[PDB]
Curated annotation (Swiss-Prot):
Compartments where found: Cytoplasm
Outcome of mutating A262Q: No effective fatty acid oxidation. No effect on electron transport from NADPH to FMN. Nearly wild-type level of high-spin conversion with laurate/dodecanoate, palmitoleate and arachidonate
Cystine residue pairs: none
Gene: cyp102A1
Chain intervals for the UniProt region annotation (Cytochrome P450): 1-453
Outcome of swapping T266A: Contrary to wild-type, significant decrease in the formation of the high-spin complex via substrate binding, and decreased substrate-induced reduction potential shift with saturating concentrations of arachidonate
Protein name (database record): Bifunctional cytochrome P450/NADPH--P450 reductase
Biotechnology: This protein is a target of protein engineering. Its selectivity-directing and activity-enhancing mutations have been extensively studied and the designed mutations allow this enzyme to act on non-native substrates and/or in order to enhance production of synthetically desirable end-products.
Cited function: Functions as a fatty acid monooxygenase. Catalyzes hydroxylation of fatty acids at omega-1, omega-2 and omega-3 positions. Shows activity toward medium and long-chain fatty acids, with optimum chain lengths of 12, 14 and 16 carbons (lauric, myristic, and palmitic acids). Able to metabolize some of these primary metabolites to secondary and tertiary products. Marginal activity towards short chain lengths of 8-10 carbons. Hydroxylates highly branched fatty acids, which play an essential role in membrane fluidity regulation.
Family: In the N-terminal section; belongs to the cytochrome P450 family.
Effect of R45 to Q/S: 2-3-fold decrease in binding affinity for N-myristoyl-L-methionine as substrate
Site-annotated residues for Important for catalytic activity: T266
Amino acid sequence: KEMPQPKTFGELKNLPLLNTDKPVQALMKIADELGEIFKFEAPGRVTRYLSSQRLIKEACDESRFDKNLSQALKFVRDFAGDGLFTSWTHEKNWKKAHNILLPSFSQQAMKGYHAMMVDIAVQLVQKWERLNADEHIEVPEDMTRLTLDTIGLCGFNYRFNSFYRDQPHPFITSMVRALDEAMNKLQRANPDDPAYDENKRQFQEDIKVMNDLVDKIIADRKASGEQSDDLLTHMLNGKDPETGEPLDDENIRYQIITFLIAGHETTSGLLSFALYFLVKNPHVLQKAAEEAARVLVDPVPSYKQVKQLKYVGMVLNEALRLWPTAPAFSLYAKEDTVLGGEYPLEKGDELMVLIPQLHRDKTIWGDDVEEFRPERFENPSAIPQHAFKPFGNGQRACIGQQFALHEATLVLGMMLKHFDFEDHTNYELDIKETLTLKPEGFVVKAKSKKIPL
Ligand code: HEM
Ligand SMILES: O=C(O)[C@H](Cc1ccccc1)NC(=O)[C@@H]1CCCCN1C(=O)CCC1CCCCC1
């Protein structure tokens, strides 16, 4: 069958469709119009966007397809290097780093990160306890303070001290401006127009800021000998069981930059969306708050208690269904192959998985796909294979999944234990797009229940 394609712009093909502040949402709209698969061309580029479980289940067969670096990831690679997120599966450092780091990101490993995750969570709760009666919370702003600080502390025992600032730490200034440049480059017609020379100079300066802080951190740890409960420790001492080799200091730097990227707004977005859905769905808020009160019986939550928050976990999954904060990933065909019995592909041909659209497949979820219903996830094994992919696919799935969900469950549980929430402005969802998604301008008021820490 002949593949549908959206509107074109003469010799720029489909490229100006991405010249928008909200490209994911635009692509979602195209999928609604065109269906489960459409072709997208640009000068020198062809991809196919997939939206249905039927076709994505095939895309997710690792014998047939492998992770591709999207143009976005190729631009992120200029500062994330051959870290896990921006390496090809066949590069030696991918499987080396993968083997070394997998045990440090397991569910068992979360027991050892718990104490420092509580450190930052308590900082958030204390900030909100200390607000005056008149005052509101800037939700994505505070969630990002929390998630960045947690990965800094758990990852390399570095305190960004985001709750002590209005101005982001200079590393985060540089990282955010670099991520912005990478996303802004995708859209651009004539990349080497003199107009973008300033952009390029700033890009190089921000890479240097990031490299300088992180390489100093790594060198300070090597020159101290100190052993922490952190990823930097394990990367400095660990050996890949397969090659017998450690990571070198340049790759360790790339992994740290990678983890700081993920721990920024990709993780903070999940919390911001979950609180959005909770204040728009009071009966769901009631259930989640009741669970928190019943389960979190101590001033300091334990690891075991966070595992006990089943309903809180269901809320977070349902927020990942509607607004997966890392909303796409890319694949390539390893050999010539036919997709869904209808769409012949050549070796090297690219696919893109539009995760928010996969998660609105009515043939899987039913017609009420836009509703916020945590009960969809009461039993994980009711969900068909390959229907729910907020953390990607296969050996190239998110290594930080257990970390992100432990942190999110802890924090959301403590927020629900300690405060009542009010959508005082009747907030209208407005999703800003960077590398990730977030509900821009989302504000609430938090009335303390006056329960001691
Ligand atoms: C809700 C929060 C998060 C979501 C939705 C998420 C989502 C994803 C997705 C969809 C991928 C696959 C990317 C692709 O195929 O191109 C991925 C990969 C990855 N994520 Fe996450 N992520 C989250 C949090 C984190 C955190 C907190 C970390 C680290 C501390 C992390 C580290 C990684 C790494 C290293 C990879 C590459 C894994 C590999 O290819 O070996 N992520 N993430
Ligand atoms: O990067 C790409 O080739 C294509 C866009 C593109 C560019 C040029 C030509 C064709 C398609 N990217 C995408 O389609 C998607 C959706 C729109 C935003 C960019 N994007 C992405 O995947 C962003 C990459 C990752 C970064 C962290 C995880 C979540 C997103």
